[PDB]
Write a protein that binds this ligand. Structure first.
Ligand SMILES: O=C(O)c1ccccc1O
Ligand SMILES: O=C(O)c1ccccc1O
Lengths: 677, 677
């Protein structure tokens, strides 16, 4: 009453059409828009040199008073977590532990130059290292001994050198693939990664890492299973060898879990003014090695040790570009998996801080990091999750924290490093699992998605299962394709609702859920909140016939039955509706006198040939019975998809469309009134 | 002016909500609806016995006066086409030619009992026979000779017996798979077969059949290539052996092409009163064998001959159920391909004749036909296209035409059959290719789809290429998945249009295409005709910022720049909008004074967590700038997906939704007026 007064003529498709005229729509430089491109203006080249290389954006516009201290503390904490994590994922890749430090040094600084993100700790990610180890073991199995000229002892250095070479080759291929896709504007694919998809995939990866590193801390040595059901085989191999373990390895492993627990207690025990957000991992690892040395558990009970760490920067060496023909498949796998994880982490942290990250630029930077690392004896690299979260939470606000972490790792790899010699894998195990703590707390997504929407739970659980029992490349591909199939499903089980009319107004709402929307007499309105295409075409027609209670086949059957029982003694010059071929008797079953069916197309986004054909069949059938059909809510896309197909041959069909549900209702009533003459 | 007078109060989501109340919605027998099921009423059991076995629907309700003659003529024509086609596809499957007659006899009558369709000629389909031949050759290669005790000559009968056994095994597995899927209500999958998908897939199959049977009529013998790029290898093998051909084989092959051409001329030459729609194939094959015998081309130039046809019905024999472990993959392939083709043909012919066919019931019937045929030495069976089209066009109106064709084939296989002994493969080649004529004319879909819609052309061409260069199982799977990906694409490139307002009315149309829809001042309206979900979330936000000309990031940047240049001398107690933190100067760039952004959700079918998050970000950003955001066109699904996620924490957010674009516009104007106090 207060507002919303319109009082306009009924806009049938023809009426509204003549009350409009088309604009020129003349585009500028049709076909070849590139003439306005290829300009040498300083601004465009400046933007190009910014976007292909974003280091020139930070150093000029770099605040010093507050960014520096946060960068220092974040860099210290990140490097602290980088060291044992790098060593652990190095030995998880069946390579000498030093290459973990190599991986923690070179790609980090190169990404700091080329990466587009402010909270990411580039480094040796667990799953990428696990794939590297899988291929390295597969091509160089432990029972293949290449006889040299020495024959001194059963030296493993030849095997490890071959493993390093094959790792270098596969990582070069991953870098080349990532660079090619990045320059091919392939970073748009980073959008088919839903939040539950990434959550479940990374959680499954956490389970994989947990089981493998669990094999490590027990002191038991078993075969490195890989492929489908890899985690099952690995964990049953560990359980089959729960016996003959190393008791002191568990002693120190639970002891360093104990120092983490006493670290949470240490936050309440020893802190007055000095302790910063201390990287408890450094004190944990130092205490572990010191306590192990003092208690004499290695020399008395033979705990496994990280091993000799050859000091010195190794010179660059061109890798053998001849293993590609038998490593390319899982090189593709590693590239895709690493890019997906790092871009998801970057996007997730880009919402907390307001800025944005360029996906394909991230692809280019990560690929160049991997390639040049391959040149410098470095296995494959992406964004780890625990380290990146630690760097963000500590307070770093520029990639200089990563640069400082790389500086610390360089200091470890060049000057010092003798102290980390006598270090047990149990400490590394605890470091990794504690880093897995939050990633495992991430199962809280299941009840929340169960309450919120079960399709998101379906994507989450499917991603979890496919990335747990199958591999992780195959799990990722299956999870993405299921994600797209779930979107498809959501258009094949829509909300078929029959619309009533709110009294005295033009608002139309579901009839059988509000008890105040008594439907207009003589009219049935059917609405689908989904596009009408091939995969949802016959479902729509069947639902229309079933739900409205108006079945043309049943009506014709009843009509011929009643007629049988009664007798006991222009170029398309076709009217779309047929009259009633009845003598107006009462033998037929008295149902309703519905005379028009108003299909709602306000929610129908698009149509195709099959949908056009099925509406043609619907209109033809209801016209044969004697029931008009009006398509309400005509849009540009719907009428375009109806005109392109030979639907609007216009016997009268252009007069059926209406621009609103109320427009169709009023048109039907006006036509009925004009028929009562 | 004439109609459409409403004059209602502005229905914001809170206002509309209180003017409604929910109905009870109490469902009947929640959870366990099966208590009302499992009833023994005669009607339900009658419908069950009808639906699992539809032979009891025709014989009772069978008109005799007009159906009989059409059934006779259609059955004669169909059996005529069945004989040479069956023999040709038998020898195309690397089996003795009699099994073509076996395949044309048993499954036809069994489908006549169990099938649900009135225009289908069940029989030895070309592609299914080609897959059968591929597996039979693969498991029994031509260079594997099993030495018996005879050693008389290089007898091929042992090889052919092994080929028959392996064909029987794979066909039993296909029948079992089809029956299991049919009883598992898997016939719903028959809806992911778009018209262009089937058209292109069958056209590619026609190309495959053309090339293979082309190998046949040249009289040249080459290796039967199979796998990926199978057609390329086969045709280059034929071209490599164009030399050393059989000249008389081409003579008779082009001669019977000549008799087909003279048959089109014969329609105008010899027809006064007697000739029915004659099955020209019978006269063609009889004339071919008679002319070849009279002209003495075999005995003088050694043309290839069909071979001895052992007369007599062979007794049933249980097939070896031990090859399954190495035939199951392409048994699955054959089952899926055959079911897809036959269901597409049935659905296509079910629209020309008004009735309907049950997909999963077709699966059950076809599977039982294949299984029992496997019991009776019969290779795999589905619906051929040329024969089915011939049967429909001739005039048959019940599956009794197929039964009559089976009777004719039985007469050929039992009483007669000696006449078909001296028959050349060239006649069979011409029969098959002429049957391919229309299937090749089916390329007319390309320009038509180019004019109509290029997504349907994309599905057509992708299906063609994937089913031509790759295999046909792999081609079908790839084509279907691309079909679903095209549906996905259609929601990632929607029509982002800014809406103006038709003067004096409430109709909102695209602003920059009609020159009469001058937009309401101070308001920008943005509309997407697509759901807002993960795969189309950031595209929507970027398009909203870019297309409306309102960028919050640019506005904040300009605001801080102007401020810098100026200085030359409840539990969520947050207001969603922030006021203007400006001293009202002129240094900032004077653009537009847009104060609200009305997003259109009438076309948005659904949402998820990512879409809810991105609208939250949009609202928060524009509120920080000082611009209101109103979601127009609230629907049940959209508000449900907004309430389930923690979007409606209601600081004031429940007041932003509106039920129509005009409602949002009037609400914005009223609020602005109330602000000018
Ligand atoms: O860095 C890890 O150890 C890790 C591994 C898999 C998943 C998430 C992670 O943080
Ligand atoms: O019957 C055939 O030969 C045929 C083969 C492939 C595709 C369509 C067909 O009609």
């Amino acid at each position: 009453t207060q507002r919303y007064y319109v009082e306009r003529p009924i806009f049938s498709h023809p009426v509204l059409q003549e009350r409009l005229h088309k604009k020129d729509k003349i585009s500028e430089s049709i076909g070849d828009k590139l003439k306005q491109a290829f300009t040498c203006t300083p601004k465009k080249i400046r933007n190009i040199i910014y976007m292909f290389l974003p280091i020139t954006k930070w150093l000029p516009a770099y605040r010093f008073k507050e960014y520096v201290l946060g960068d220092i503390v974040s860099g210290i904490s990140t490097g602290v977590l980088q060291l044992p994590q790098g060593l652990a994922f190095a030995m998880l890749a069946a390579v000498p532990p030093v290459f973990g430090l190599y991986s923690s040094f070179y790609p980090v600084i190169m990404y700091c130059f080329f990466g587009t993100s402010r909270h990411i700790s580039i480094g040796p990610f667990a799953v990428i290292s696990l794939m590297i180890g899988g291929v390295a073991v597969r091509l160089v199995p432990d029972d293949i001994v290449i006889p040299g000229g020495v024959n001194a002892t059963n030296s493993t250095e030849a095997r490890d050198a071959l493993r390093v070479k094959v790792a270098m080759s596969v990582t070069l291929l991953t870098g080349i693939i990532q660079f090619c896709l990045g320059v091919c504007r392939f970073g748009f694919v980073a959008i088919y990664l839903t939040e539950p998809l990434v959550r479940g995939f990374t959680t499954a990866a956490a389970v994989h890492v947990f089981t493998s590193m669990l094999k490590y801390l027990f002191g038991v040595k078993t075969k490195r299973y890989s492929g489908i059901f890899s985690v099952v085989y690995s964990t049953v191999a560990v359980l089959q060898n729960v016996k003959n373990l190393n008791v002191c390895s568990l002693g120190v492993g639970l002891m360093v879990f104990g120092l983490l627990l006493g670290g949470k207690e240490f936050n309440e025990r020893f802190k007055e003014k000095l302790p910063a957000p201390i990287p408890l991992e450094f004190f944990a690892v130092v205490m572990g090695t010191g306590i192990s040395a003092g208690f004499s558990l290695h020399e008395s009970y033979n705990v496994d040790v990280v091993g000799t760490l050859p000091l010195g920067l190794l010179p660059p060496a061109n890798p053998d570009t001849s293993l590609f023909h038998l490593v390319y498949v899982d090189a593709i796998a590693i590239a895709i998996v690493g890019f997906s994880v790092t871009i998801s982490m970057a996007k997730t942290l880009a919402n907390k801080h307001g800025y944005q990250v360029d996906g394909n630029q991230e692809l280019i930077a990560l690929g160049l990091c991997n390639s040049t690392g391959s040149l410098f004896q470095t296995f494959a690299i992406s964004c780890s999750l625990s380290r990146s979260l630690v760097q963000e939470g500590t307070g770093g606000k520029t990639q200089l924290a990563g640069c400082l972490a790389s500086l610390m790792i360089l200091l470890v790899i060049l000057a010092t490093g003798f102290l980390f010699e006598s270090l047990p894998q149990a400490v590394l195990s605890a470091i990794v699992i504690v880093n897995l703590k939050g990633m495992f707390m991430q199962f809280s997504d299941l009840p929340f998605f169960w309450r919120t929407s079960k399709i998101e739970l379906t994507i989450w659980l499917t991603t979890f299962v496919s990335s747990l029992f199958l591999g992780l490349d195959y799990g990722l591909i299956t999870a993405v394709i299921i994600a797209l199939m779930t979107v498809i499903y959501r258009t094949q089980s829509p909300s078929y609702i029959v619309l009533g009319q709110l009294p005295d107004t033009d608002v139309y709402i579901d009839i059988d859920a509000y008890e105040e929307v008594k439907e207009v007499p003589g009219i049935k309105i059917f609405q689908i909140n989904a596009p009408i295409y091939y995969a949802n075409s016959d479902l729509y027609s069947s639902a229309l016939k079933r739900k409205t209670g108006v079945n043309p086949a049943f009506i014709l059957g009843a009509r011929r039955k009643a007629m049988k029982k009664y007798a006991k003694e222009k170029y398309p010059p076709i009217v779309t509706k047929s009259t009633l071929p009845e003598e107006l008797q009462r033998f037929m079953p008295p149902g309703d006198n519905v005379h028009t069916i108003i299909l709602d197309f306000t929610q129908v986004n698009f149509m195709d040939s099959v949908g056009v054909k099925t509406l043609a069949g619907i209109v033809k059938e209801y016209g044969d019975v004697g029931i008009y059909v009006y398509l309400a809510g005509c849009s540009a896309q719907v009428v375009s998809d109806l005109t392109q197909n030979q639907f609007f041959e216009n016997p009268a069909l252009l007069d059926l469309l209406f621009h609103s549900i109320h427009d169709a209702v009023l048109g039907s009533q006006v036509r009925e009134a004009l028929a009562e003459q």
